[PDB]
Amino acid sequence: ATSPEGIWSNSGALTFEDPADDSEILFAGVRDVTITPAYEHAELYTIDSTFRDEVKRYEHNVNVEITYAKFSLEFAQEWLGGPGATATASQDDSDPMKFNLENVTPSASGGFERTTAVENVVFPELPLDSATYGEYEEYSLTGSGRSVTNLADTSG
Amino acid sequence: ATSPEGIWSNSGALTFEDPADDSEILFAGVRDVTITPAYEHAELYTIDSTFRDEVKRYEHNVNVEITYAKFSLEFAQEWLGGPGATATASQDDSDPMKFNLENVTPSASGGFERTTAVENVVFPELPLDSATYGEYEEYSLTGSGRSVTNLADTSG
Amino acid sequence: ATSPEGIWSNSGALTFEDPADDSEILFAGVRDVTITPAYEHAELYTIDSTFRDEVKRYEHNVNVEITYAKFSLEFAQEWLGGPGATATASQDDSDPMKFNLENVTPSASGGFERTTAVENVVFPELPLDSATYGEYEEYSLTGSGRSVTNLADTSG
Amino acid sequence: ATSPEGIWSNSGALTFEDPADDSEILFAGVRDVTITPAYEHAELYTIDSTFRDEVKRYEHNVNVEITYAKFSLEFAQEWLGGPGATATASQDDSDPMKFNLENVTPSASGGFERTTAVENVVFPELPLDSATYGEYEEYSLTGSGRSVTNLADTSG
Amino acid sequence: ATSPEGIWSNSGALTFEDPADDSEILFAGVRDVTITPAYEHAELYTIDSTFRDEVKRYEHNVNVEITYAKFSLEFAQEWLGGPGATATASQDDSDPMKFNLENVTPSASGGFERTTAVENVVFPELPLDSATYGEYEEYSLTGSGRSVTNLADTSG
Amino acid sequence: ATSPEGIWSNSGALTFEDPADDSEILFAGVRDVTITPAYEHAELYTIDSTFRDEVKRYEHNVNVEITYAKFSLEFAQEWLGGPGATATASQDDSDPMKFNLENVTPSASGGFERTTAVENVVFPELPLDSATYGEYEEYSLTGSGRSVTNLADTSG
Amino acid sequence: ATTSASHHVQAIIDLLEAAPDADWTPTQTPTVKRYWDDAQSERGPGADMPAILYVWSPTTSSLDRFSMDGDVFDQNDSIEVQAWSFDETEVEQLQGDIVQILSEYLDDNEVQTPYSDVAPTGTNDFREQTPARTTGHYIMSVEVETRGLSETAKNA
Amino acid sequence: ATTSASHHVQAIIDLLEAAPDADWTPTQTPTVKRYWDDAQSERGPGADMPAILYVWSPTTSSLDRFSMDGDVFDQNDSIEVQAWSFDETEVEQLQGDIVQILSEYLDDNEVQTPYSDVAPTGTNDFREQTPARTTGHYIMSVEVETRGLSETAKNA
Amino acid sequence: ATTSASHHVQAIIDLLEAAPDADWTPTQTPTVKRYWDDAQSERGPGADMPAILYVWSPTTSSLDRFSMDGDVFDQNDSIEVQAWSFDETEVEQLQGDIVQILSEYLDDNEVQTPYSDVAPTGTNDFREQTPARTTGHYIMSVEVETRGLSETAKNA
Amino acid sequence: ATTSASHHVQAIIDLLEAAPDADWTPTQTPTVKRYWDDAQSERGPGADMPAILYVWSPTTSSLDRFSMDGDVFDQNDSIEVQAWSFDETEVEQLQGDIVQILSEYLDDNEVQTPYSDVAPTGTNDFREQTPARTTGHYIMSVEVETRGLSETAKNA
Amino acid sequence: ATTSASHHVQAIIDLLEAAPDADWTPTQTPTVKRYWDDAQSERGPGADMPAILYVWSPTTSSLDRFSMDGDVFDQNDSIEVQAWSFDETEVEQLQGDIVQILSEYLDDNEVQTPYSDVAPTGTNDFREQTPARTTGHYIMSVEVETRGLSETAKNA
Amino acid sequence: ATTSASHHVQAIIDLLEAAPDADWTPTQTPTVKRYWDDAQSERGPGADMPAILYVWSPTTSSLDRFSMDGDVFDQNDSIEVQAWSFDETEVEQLQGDIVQILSEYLDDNEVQTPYSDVAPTGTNDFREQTPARTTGHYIMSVEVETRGLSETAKNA
Structure with a gap:
């Protein structure tokens, strides 16, 4: 097994990708x-037992859930435009933009590096x-992904 | 793409317009x-899968959402009057006053100039x-606009 | 148009009146x-568009909404007594006392003097x-008026 | 009319009475x-008008609503006992104890003396x-009375 | 009647008893x-009158409602065991453990000794x-008793 | 009976076990x-009495309820995997991972040592x-166990 | 009224001077002075003379706004009374007496004083300071605060 | 109207000098000065002369931002006025007078002064400092705060 | 009651003097004094004499309002007890003893003393201050707070 | 543009030096200096010379983390500008002038300066300190704060 | 077990003295002393002697009420340990060692010590104080806090 | 990697010494020292020599508990770095250099340093202190915090 360890928040590299390409969508701060x-x-529960x-x-x-402080114009225009397109105005269509999300984070001693990847946020x-x-x-930002695609130690 | 950047709040110029004219309605502070x-x-979700x-x-x-501290008599009289009119008293009619809204904000380094425009707030x-x-x-003020008509870098 | 301006709270003169007379009801503090x-x-909203x-x-x-710190016997006895009467005890009748309200307030520079008047509070x-x-x-006090009867600059 | 005035809280004398006797029930602090x-x-409101x-x-x-810090054994035993009785235990009966309440308070200058009397609290x-x-x-204590029996200037 | 008086919280001795025995269940802190x-x-209320x-x-x-800082194994094992028994594990049965509760408290001057007793908490x-x-x-702990069995001055 | 006693929080040894093995799952901090x-x-309650x-x-x-500050990669992969399996991704199945939980805690004086054990959290x-x-x-973490399997003094 | 004095220091002197000989614990009624009535080398009584009380205002009186009307300041005033004698028990009796005198008028709504409230807020012992070799004064004090509504002439 | 002064110290001097002779309690109207008008050994009145008021700003004026417009500062200003005389009664009368004078203008929205608000916010007695042997000045003071919307160059 | 004392300093002297010889750790029962009983050069014991405890009130007693009635103050008093001896072990033992003596009466409902509560609130070591060459005294202390309801005679 | 200076003290000097002769109220444009440009005996202007402004940073500049990226510090800087002259009204005009000058650039988005914000945040008068016998400098000051995003090179 | 000492200063001396020679980083095990063991002119080691640790209690030990039973004080104790040596690296090693030694016993449930918790809570470096011309002691320290349940004998 | 030092002062010295010559603004790479490396009368550089940086810890390091495990402390350390030179421009450049050097390592996973975080948290200017008449050192400083998980002996 791998020993549990503290994690310094700032070490996490959060990224977004277009699931059509796996190309990065710029996001920061x-x-x-x-x-x-x-x-x-x-x-x-039934009449048989008080226990579950x-x-x-x-x-x-x-x-x-994300709080952030640097505005990304690309991320906003991706959100407006829906899947596979950017837009400069609200779009009158039924498909929300789906983002792939990945966060990579070494532990406090570097004892492991968790990679969390979330599909279709x-x-x-x-x-x-x-x-x-x-x-x-x-x-x-508040949102939701479909599933975790990856949760592993990516060290070494 | 344009690099994400911090934004100083006070850099933003907010304006309201009558959608009949594109004439400014005075608002401040x-x-x-x-x-x-x-x-x-x-x-x-269906019985097929636990996933979405x-x-x-x-x-x-x-x-x-707006908090402000300079009172505008024009803005109030426009709100009372409904579309295309001003009033000094409550009006017994079904049409709310619709304002076009625009906020123009230079980025912290001047790297972009975010213009956000909203119709029929x-x-x-x-x-x-x-x-x-x-x-x-x-x-x-709490209110609702119909759509974002513009979200763009308006620099240069 | 009149330039929007800050307003010092304490400049506002609030008054209540009996709508049967337009006579003042003493209230203060x-x-x-x-x-x-x-x-x-x-x-x-309908199937044919996502927009409003x-x-x-x-x-x-x-x-x-009013918070106040000087008690008024007249205001309280007017409230008890209902329209056109005062009482020293609760009244078993269906008509609440209706107060006309006016607040008159000069702006910070004296650029305007807004009068707000509300009927049947x-x-x-x-x-x-x-x-x-x-x-x-x-x-x-929490209460509600039927309409704004006046919102105007009363300067000059 | 009597001029509205500030009131020092601690000037208020609050008393409870048994409505069967008008005899005082001891309460304090x-x-x-x-x-x-x-x-x-x-x-x-109807389709005829947007106004009330x-x-x-x-x-x-x-x-x-009362917050207090001197315990009264009589007040508690009256509450347990119901109308016209005291008890050292919960009583299995449907009648709550009704207290007449009176609060007497001089205004800050002695300009008036508010008496408030509430029946059947x-x-x-x-x-x-x-x-x-x-x-x-x-x-x-949180409770409620049937009506205000008296609200008047008591002075002179 | 007895004069109302302040009560110092720490003067109060709280105890729990098994209602099968009147034997003490150890609880403290x-x-x-x-x-x-x-x-x-x-x-x-009816159409006859606006008054109650x-x-x-x-x-x-x-x-x-009790907040406490010393853990009791007896109290916990009594609670698990239900009426007239103790247990080291959850019991799959319909009867909650009923505790008799008593709190005995001298007033600030020793003017009275408030005994409060509550059955079947x-x-x-x-x-x-x-x-x-x-x-x-x-x-x-949040819980509820069936009735107050005793509320009296137990002095002398 | 055992005297009730204060407990210093940090004395507690919390552990999680796979109920298929009674093997430990690493968790910390x-x-x-x-x-x-x-x-x-x-x-x-019925018409016959006001009492219960x-x-x-x-x-x-x-x-x-657990708040913790050392990330366990094993615990997360166990939660993802469900009973008797570990996974690097969300699993599309109806069985949640069930953890046996045990917390062993000495008294502040060493006078007793409570073990609390909970099945199928x-x-x-x-x-x-x-x-x-x-x-x-x-x-x-917020979760629910089926029952307490053990609550006893573990000393001697 | 007992005082009607223009300033708080004279007001408290008038209250202490108004006390009957029976309300002082010692045989001789103390002499009451402003702190500046006496030179420092001569401060405190001589032998075969009554004890001396010195009154002054040690800290800033607050003038808070009462309301938007601006008729009134909520005025809070501060005073210290020092008791001087060669008898370590006489000063203790005087501290008791000063409290007991000035604990009348506690919620005097301008009946006796020009205030709403005169209250002892704290007391000091300084007997630890008196050098044990020499005859020399023991000193103890009462801190008093004093609150009322004070007119502004803003609205004539 | 009455002042139109450049700075708060001169503004309050102009207010105190603008007071009618009838609004001072003593027979002879005081002389108003800046604190720095007189050398220290010369400071305070001579015998057979009117009492002196010394005005200055004892602490930092704040310049808070009013809004995102940057069009104005919410300027807050601080002043002390010291009354000097040989009569312990006259300084007390003057403290009263200074308060009654500067309690006009309390919510002057730039009608008389360049401010929204000139207010006494506290008062001090220092009579306890005057040594009793020597003839010497008694001193008392009023602390005054002063608030208004102050312009900026930002928007031209 | 063991004390019935006029003032807190004498009250705690009486408590320390009332302690049996068996409750002190050393062979000789200490001598209890007011801080001002002894001159400074002679403060602390001589050789071949019992250790000395000096009692005084170091800080202001609070007199908080208990209620609107004003029958009593909630009075909070502060004391320090200093133990002086040449034996560094004896002062440590005395610090223990003083705590153990004054930890009786912790929630005295005015049975033994004129207080609801006499409590050690902290302790000090000053042994680091005794210079090692010379046979000077070691000093340690206990800080004691004391609380009760104190009658006002407001309502006679 | 107007400055591009490496440090805040030089930045404020550059802004004051950039001010046109027309924007200063006096006849002669003040000389701007670093506080350490002059020795203490020489400090302040001579007669028949323009007034002097001394600029320095009196307190610690804060560096705050802007985000988990670590690209920039949110940097907050503090400055004081002291105006020295023999004319008590000239320093007052200079205080007004400095505030006016530095009230440009209030929400400069790094266009003129290297900052997001340069602001006067408070002002001081020290004229009360100048002793009246001697000719000697009157002194007044402006406190300036300054904020921007400052690069770290953490991520190259 | 390891200490059972009557006072916190002796307890920490006992802990440091109980440390094996192998747990000290330097060749020679330090001497542990009370601060008051040595005269000031002789404080710190001589050349060729082992380093010295001085232990004492610098601030007031708090005694807090644990519960309204009154059996126990929640006692919080404060200590400083100063390491003195001529070697700037040796004091740094000793600081590391003291932290390590006293990081055992961190949640000792009264097994080793008479406490629930002995913990280093901060550390100080004072090497900057040692004048560089002279041979003279370098000094560094560990601040230590110590917590437990301390008996009152209130209930015997 | 770059440091691995036992204490924070040597750790930051090792970082500043590890900087390439290209990353300093002046022609000559500064000399880095502990504050105690040099005596006061020759502290700072001579003429014809590189500027000197002095490093030390000015305030207490915190050792906070990380969890109930006691396996680690959350350690927060504080450092000041002072730059000394005869050139006012060089110290300003050095301040900019120290910041942009120590803003590497901002979020180490103990990769280069033994820390989670080394950060400049503020900067000071002291150029106003240097008397302009004499040749003498200008001084400026950087305040640096440093944070990491730190081990304990508790579990071994």
Whole structure:
């Protein structure tokens, strides 16, 4: 087994890619990154017992929450344009832009390097302008991916 | 592509226009400005798989949040009057005043000049008085625009 | 157009009047005053577009919030008594007391003097005793007016 | 009319009485006292107008909230006992104890003396013990009265 | 009657007893203790009057909330075991353990000794572990008793 | 009986085991740990009495809350893989990974040593990345075990 | 009224001078002075004379805004009273007495004083300072705060 | 109107000098000076002369940003006024007078002064400092704060 | 009661003097004194004499308002006890002893003392200050707080 | 453009030196210096010479992390400008002038300066210090803050 | 076990003295002393002698109420350990060693020591103070905190 | 890799010494020293010599608990680097150099350094201190924090 270890946040290299190409979409300046695989759980109880008889998992998604401080014009225009196209205006069409996401992070001693990869992340809403007087703009994304494609030690 | 960059909030010039004319409606003294394009998302799940089959987007709107501290009498009288008119009293009619909105913001290094334009922003409620003893008045607008008409680098 | 300007809170003269007379009802010692014209908005969406097709407004009211620190017996007895009467006890009748309200406020430079006037303000609840040990009593009113009767520059 | 005036909280004398006798029930050491006459408001709107056509008040009560720090054994035993009785244990009967409440308070200059009297105040729950380590016990009552029987200047 | 008086929290001695025996169950290290008899109130209103016509009480319980910092194996094993037994593991049975509770408290001057006793207190949940790094463990119980069996001055 | 006693949080040795083997799954660096056996309670009330007639318990589960700061790659791959397997990607299957949990904790005086053991803990969601700029990553687990298998003094 | 004095220092002198001989614990009623009545080498009593109380205002009086009206300042004033004697028990009795005198008028709403509240807020012992070889004064003190509404003549 | 002064110190001097003779309590109107008008040994009045007021700014004025426009500063200014006389009564009368004078203009929105607000915010007594043997000046002071929207060059 | 003392300093002297000889760790029971009982050059014991405890009140006693009634202050008092001896072991033993003596009465409901609470709140070591060449005293101390309800005579 | 200076002190000097003769209120344009350009005895202007401004950085410049990227510090810089003259009104005019000059560039997006923001944030008057017998310099100052994104070369 | 000492200073001396020779980095095991063991002119080692550690308690030990049983104080103790040597590297090694030695016992549940927790909480370097001309001691220190449950004998 | 040093002061000296000659702005690479390498009267460079950097730790290093495991401390260290030269331009250049040197290593996974993070956190100018009359050193400084997980002996 690999020994559990602390992780310094800043070591994480977050990236986005167009799933049509595997080409990078420029994104930068993160402050918070939370990635959380989830399922709905259904528990079986009956008159037979007060204890849980069964538990099962369904409705898989990966919650993605990001706070960031550098505006990316490409990322915003990708979001507007939907799959396989950029746009300079809202598009009257039903397909949300799907981003592949990958975050690569060495542990505090370099004892391992976790790579987390998440497919088909979509964001229901995109902050464009987010200004407060006497400060730099700051932006929050909430979205969800279809699945984790990779969670492994990528060291060596 | 254009490199992502930080943005100083105070660099942003916000303006409102009458969509009948493209004439300016005077507004000033902003302290917060948030502009967020959004869609409702719907996700397909079936007995075939625990993973998401499909995702689609609908009900587009642009959320607009503004905090400001210079009162505009024109903006208030436009809001009361409805489309193509001003009023000094509440109007007993079904049409809300629709404002075109534009925010122009140079990036921190001048590397790009983000122009965001939103059509037909409407505000369900308008603050007229917002007094607290020993302070200047401060006002909050929450509203929704129909679409982003423009999101581009407008430099050069 | 009149240039937008800051407003010093304490410059505002708030008054209440009996709508049967236009006679003043004595009220004083305000600490906060928020006046907010509002409507319910209904937005039309249909299969033929993701964008908003129409927006319309209905259920006009003016939200009135006041915090104040001087007790008024007249205001309280007017509230108890209902329209055109005063009482020293709760009244078993269906008509709430309707107050006309006006707030007159010069801008910070005296560039304009905005008058806000609201008809038929009613208060669902009235604070009486509102004691806290080692402090002067403070009272909160939430209520609603039927419409704004005047919003204008009353300078000159 | 009587000039509105500030009120020093600690000047208020609060008393409870058995409505069968008008005899005093011993109570002491209040920290907060809020008394709020309240009605439900129903508003009429129709297709004829966006403005409110009618408003009517119904379902009256006087909301009463008290924070206090001297425990009264009599007040608790009255509450347990129900109307016209005291008990050392919970009583299995449907009648809550009704207290007449009166609060008498001179204004800050002695310009007037507010008496507020509330009939048939009932408390859904009674705190008996409210210990926090290294503090004196503090108790919160929430309850409601049927009506205000008196709100007047008591001076002279 | 007895004069109302302040109560120093730490004067209160709290104990739990098995209602089968009146034998003590060892419990200690209290930090907060709230005991609150309660009823549901139903109020009658009709078209005859805006004022409350009747009020009645039903569905009696005594809310018990305790914060404590010394762990008891006896209390936990009693809770697991249900009435008249102890267990080292969860029990697949329908009866919760019922504790008699008593709190005895001298007032600040020794003017009275408030004894509060509550029958058949049950706790829907039991904290077993409540660790936080660099602190001693602290535990919260919420539960409810059937009735107050005793509330009296036990002095002399 | 054993005297109730204070517990220094950091004394606790938390471990996870695969229930197929009783083999240890590597996990480390806890900051908060809450373990809470619970049941739903149902209370019987009828017209015959205002007091509670009966109370019964059902839907046993053990709530597990953990905050931790050392990332375990094994624990995450076990959670992904489901019972008796490890995976580098989300698995499209209905069986959640079940962990046996044990926490062993001496008293602050060494007077007893509680072992809490919980069967078949499952977590609806797993955090993978939890970055905040200028901090080490911190992770929160919320889950539910089927029952407590052991709660005893482990000493001697 | 007992005082009606123009300033807080004279007001508290008037209150201490108004005290009957029976309310002082020692045989001789103390002499009350402003701190600046006496030169330093002669400060405190001589032998065969009554003890001396020195009154002054040690720190800034606050003038807070009461409301948007601007009729009134919420004025908070601070005072110290020092008791001087050669008897280490007489100063202790005087500290007790000064508290007991000035704990009348505690919630005097301008009946006796020009204030809403005169309160001892704390007390000091300085007996540890007196050199044990020499005859020389023992000193103890009472800190007093004093609160009321003070007119501005803003609105004539 | 009354001042139109360049800086806060001269502005308050202009206000104090603008006061009618009838608005001073003593028989002879005081002389108003900047603190630096007189040398230290000459400071304070002589016998057979009117009392002296010394004005200066004791602490840093703030220039807070009002909005993103950068069009104005929310300027906050600080002043102290010292009253000097040989009569301990006259300085007390003058402290009253200074307050009553500068409590006009409390919410002057640039009508009289160049400010939104000129207010006494506290007062000091220093009579306890005057040595009792020598004839020497008594000193008391008013602390005054002053707030207004101050222009910028940013927008030309 | 063991003390019934007028003031906190004498109260704690009485508590330390009331301790049996068996409750002190050394062979000789210490001598208890007010800090001002002895002159500085003679402070601390001589050789062939029992160790000395010096008691005084180092900081301001608080007098907080308890309630709107004003019957009592919530009074909080502060004391320090210094142990002086030539034996570095004896002062350490005395620090232990003083804590063990004054940790009786911890929640005295005014049974032994005029207080609700007498508590050691901290302890000091000053042995590092004793210079090693000369046979000067070692010093250690206990800091003690003390709390109770203190009568005002406001309501007679 | 106007500066491009390597350090904040030189940057503010360059801005003050760039000011046209027309923007200074006095007849003669002030000389701008680093504080360490002159020795202390020589400091300030001679008679028949233009006034002197001394610029330096009085407090620590902060460097804050902007993001997990580590490309830039959010750098916050602090400066003071002192104006020295023999004319008590000239320093006052210079304070106004410095504020005016440096109120250009308030939200300079690195166009003129290397900063996002140069602002006056407070001002000081020290004229009260100049002793009235001797001719000697009057002194006043402007406090300036300065903010921008400063590159790290971390990622080359 | 290893110490059982009556006071924190002796406890940490015992821990440092109990350390094997192999756990010290230099050739010679340091001498451990109370700060007051040595006179100032002789403080620190002579040449050819082993290095010296001085242990003492620099700040007040807190005693906090653990619970309202009153059996126990949550006691928090403070210590500093100063390493003195002529070798700038030896003091650096000793700082490392002291941290290492006292990083055992980190969550000792009263097994080795009379405490729940002995921990280094900070470290200091003072090598910058040693004048470079003279041979003279380099000094570095470890700050140590120490926590446990301390008995009151309140309940015997 | 580059350092592997036992203590932070030597670690940062090793970083500054590891800088290529090309990464310093002046013609001559500075000499790096511990603050205690040189005596005061010859601290700083002579003429015809390279500038000197002095490194030391000015304030306490923190050792925070990372988790309940006690396996590691979250260690935060503080350093100051002072640049000394006769050229005011050279110290400014050196400040810019030190920053851009030590802004490498900003997020090491202990790759080059033994740390998670080495960061400039602020900078100081002290050029205003250097008397202009004499030749003498200008001084400027960089404040550097340094963070990492640090081992313990607890588990061995």
